Amino acid sequence: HMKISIIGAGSVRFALQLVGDIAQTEELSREDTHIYMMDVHERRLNASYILARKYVEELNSPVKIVKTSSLDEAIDGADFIINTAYPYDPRYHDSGSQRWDEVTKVGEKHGYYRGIDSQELNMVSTYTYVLSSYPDMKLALEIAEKMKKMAPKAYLMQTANPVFEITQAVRRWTGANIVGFCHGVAGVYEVFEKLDLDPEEVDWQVAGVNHGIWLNRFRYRGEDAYPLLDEWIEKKLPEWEPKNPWDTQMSPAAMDMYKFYGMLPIGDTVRNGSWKYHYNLETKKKWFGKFGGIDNEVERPKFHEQLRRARERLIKLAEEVQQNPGMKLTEEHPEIFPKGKLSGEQHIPFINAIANNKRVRLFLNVENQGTLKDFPDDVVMELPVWVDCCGIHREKVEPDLTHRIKIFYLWPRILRMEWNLEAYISRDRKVLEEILIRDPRTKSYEQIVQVLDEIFNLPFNEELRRYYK
Amino acid sequence: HMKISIIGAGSVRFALQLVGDIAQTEELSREDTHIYMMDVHERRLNASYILARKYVEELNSPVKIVKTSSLDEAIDGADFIINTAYPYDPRYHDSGSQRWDEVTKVGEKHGYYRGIDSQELNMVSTYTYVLSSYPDMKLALEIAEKMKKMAPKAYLMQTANPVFEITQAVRRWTGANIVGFCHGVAGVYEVFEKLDLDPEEVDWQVAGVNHGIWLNRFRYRGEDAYPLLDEWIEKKLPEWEPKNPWDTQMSPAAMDMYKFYGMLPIGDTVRNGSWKYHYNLETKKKWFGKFGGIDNEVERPKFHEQLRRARERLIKLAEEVQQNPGMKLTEEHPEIFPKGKLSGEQHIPFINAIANNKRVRLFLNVENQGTLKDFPDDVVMELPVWVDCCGIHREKVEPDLTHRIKIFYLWPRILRMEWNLEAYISRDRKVLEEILIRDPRTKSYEQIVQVLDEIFNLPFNEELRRYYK
Ligand SMILES: NC(=O)C1=CN([C@@H]2O[C@H](COP(=O)(O)OP(=O)(O)OC[C@H]3O[C@@H](n4cnc5c(N)ncnc54)[C@H](O)[C@@H]3O)[C@@H](O)[C@H]2O)C=CC1
Ligand SMILES: NC(=O)C1=CN([C@@H]2O[C@H](COP(=O)(O)OP(=O)(O)OC[C@H]3O[C@@H](n4cnc5c(N)ncnc54)[C@H](O)[C@@H]3O)[C@@H](O)[C@H]2O)C=CC1
Ligand SMILES: O=C(O)[C@H]1O[C@@H](O)[C@H](O)[C@@H](O)[C@@H]1O
Ligand SMILES: O=C(O)[C@H]1O[C@@H](O)[C@H](O)[C@@H](O)[C@@H]1O
Prior knowledge:
Chains A, B: InterPro entries: Alpha-glycosidase, GH4_Enzyme_sf, Glyco_hydro_4, Glyco_hydro_4_C, Lactate_DH/Glyco_Ohase_4_C, NAD(P)-bd_dom_sf. The structure is a homodimer. Chain A is of the alpha/beta class. Chain A has 2 domains: about 1-85 and about 330-360, Rossmann fold (3-Layer(aba) Sandwich); about 85-325 and about 360-469, no CATH class. Chain A is built from 17 helices and 13 strands. Chain A has helices at about 15-25, 40-60, 70-75, 95-110, 135-150, 165-175, 190-195, 225-235, 250-260, 280-290, 300-325, 330, 345-355, 405-425, 430-435, 445-455, 460-469; strands at about 1-5, 35-40, 65-70, 80-85, 155-160, 180, 200-210, 210-220, 225, 265, 360-365, 380-390, 390-395. Chain A has a 9-stranded mixed sheet with strand order 3-2-1-4-5-6-11-12-13, with helices on both faces. In chain A, α2 (about 40-60) packs across α11 and α14 runs antiparallel to α15 (about 430-435). The longest helix of chain A has 25 residues, at about 300-325.
């Protein structure tokens, strides 16, 4: 009996991907595999459940799917708990992106471009919420404590943001068996494609923290391959153009960071630069090309609207499935319901490694434990690991990250994580103030007080306001 | 034979203090004690030598005093080398304070209040020079390398700023026997005086980095004494007034920092707060009282002019001594030439501990070596140590510094030291730029380039400009 529970199974960016992967993984697509779909949004949960059931049928998979509005029921005796939830106050909002949107506009009103949650080395939209990410950390810690009673052997597979802060806090404060998941390492394959390198011929490694990872080893035919990137920078960077707002891996910003740090930032790390690349939209367009990346006042609202429409369309699609049970989702919407191909995400490979000993190399957020020797043992890093039946085994990171990455990038970002955790556990508004006192956009202490006041006074922040009272 | 060499013996703030202390220390005031006074400024050196000789005579001390314009001669076979030098370009300036003054005004011209060298947790005027402190680190490293050849057993007693950065760099890059010296810990005695506590009855300890030290233990009659500070804050802080621009130990800023960190910052640490206390002069006056402290555009030029006049007066006084050899310096200028009382500084007690086994507790800048276990072994900290014939022995720091001091204060300041060292050893202007990219006062990258350009183009920065070319 194998219980895989998806907390936040109304999630538009994970739910069906996870079900499809499980149903197309030979060792997991069994009658003994029970997928629990749990969510607080009844319409989204019902929709996700209908689609998941129909989808699994078309894939001819025998997995059992259960829906529940009870967190306890989903956790009870689970083998794996995947946290993709994004809390929201249902009195005012329909999804969690709305609270970040609105607090961001309040931040900008008081002179914080892209909101107070956007900070140096932490520009990724929605990553933190009012610095300490109260609703998101609260939920993860609640899951962790229920787990230690009701599912001791379970892995908590943390996907909801902030992955770094939350994974650290749950590990440190509860010792629950939490592992943070993010696939930003996939950006390396674009580097290899742009440099005309067969990926199977590249000897590569990446290491760092979540959204702060670096191509520390990049070798080809028994030589350092970074000279090939130097040649690309000289000859092809002038003609580089982003295909869409998300396309930044080979951007001027990424290469400027590589020149300074000595290793290429990978994936969302490229979004998480210094303020040099982010002062305003015109600056973002210089360094990321025509869209200004995704983390700006034009493209991010556009993307969040796209997600809102997608949720709504999936609810209508589920109703169409109930009205037309003969329709084939895999035929009429192959983009949403792929068949044959796996998604490439790391969650189900991890489960199959633990449960079925299908050993695999993954990039996961786990305690350092000496892998990067200049950093504390207990600090959660995003590291190359091999996973199998019987443990998570860290690769030796070689070559080591450069001196400049350590002192100018990793340590400041790790300190920010500690600031954010202290802001949460202390319940002390003065810690939030201190974080903003280190913010380049702050002009005065009075400004800090006023922006936090207005954020805290938003109706949907009642619980947050009382937490810090 | 005991050779004590003062490098920068024209120093207005140390030279005569050191000579008077040596001449009034029984075990050192001997014919076998040779004090070498070395300086590049001929008139100041000649003046300091005349006054030192006359002074020692009036103290009836048999120490021999030698003057030399040769650094090599001063280092050769020295037992102790005290570095109080403050480099300057003699084509344009007469002393080292002038280059900092002028670069500060350039910084302010480009929108950096109190200059680019003033940073969060690093407001102390003149501490660094263009971030990496090129002339000051260059001299210290030169002394260190000459030492390892010409005076292997010597201690390099580093007093010139930046003490933290320089002591770290010399230790790490040369392994010379350097110890950093600063007496900011003396602020604790004001705390005890304001709280009506006999200092001999107080069980206290301080620890941190240079100008970043904290009253980690403060106990009285077998209880924590910090409640007595809480009572003073409630009852007497409203009436507190600074006696002069330097008086900050019991200021609103110091108490605001104590409330946040849980321990009282000591001495110049109180100057080295966040930008909360330093946005502008009006802000400084709110938090430090009527003068706005010493690190502002009114009081610092006043103080540097006072030092310039003092140097000039000592040169004239030496000429008066040559014209009137019967005058008694100890009678007509007891403030400059004290008799009987020692100065209370740590330099000569240290020498007497090493050379004569007069064991003493001092607060010195030495490698951490596990004393503060959450920090690297090799990072130079300002620590309570016992010094004797045969070593420097670190006290156990108990209680440990608070979590907030570690993550919000010590680690950021330690990272800044690493940034500044990297800026020096790399010879890479991009590192200086990155430091300013983390500066809250930066509005744009172009501003950074322009302010460094104008600083580098100052005539007296020719050597610095070529170093970074
Ligand atoms: N680690 C990674 O690779 C990535 C992280 N994320 C993050 O994953 C999370 C979800 O992202 P989206 O799919 O866009 O959000 P979503 O709003 O589409 O889905 C979140 C689901 O969680 C539900 N939910 C809210 N509170 C809940 C609670 N207490 N218990 C159970 N369910 C609850 C919501 O009703 C909703 O259905 C966010 O934190 C997002 O920032 C998003 C993309 C990739
Ligand atoms: N660690 C501590 O307790 C304190 C640190 N300081 C620092 O000590 C240093 C001196 O301070 P002041 O007495 O006010 O300066 P000062 O200008 O009065 O004396 C510096 C002396 O060093 C000489 N000098 C310059 N380059 C030299 C070189 N290559 N070799 C030999 N001598 C050289 C100068 O001619 C001058 O006579 C500064 O760095 C200052 O910031 C000042 C007060 C306390
Ligand atoms: O921008 C986004 O919404 C997402 O982008 C992905 O790349 C990040 O891994 C994830 O943390 C973000 O939530
Ligand atoms: O302000 C100053 O000039 C001096 O003040 C002292 O307290 C500091 O110890 C020293 O580093 C400074 O050089």
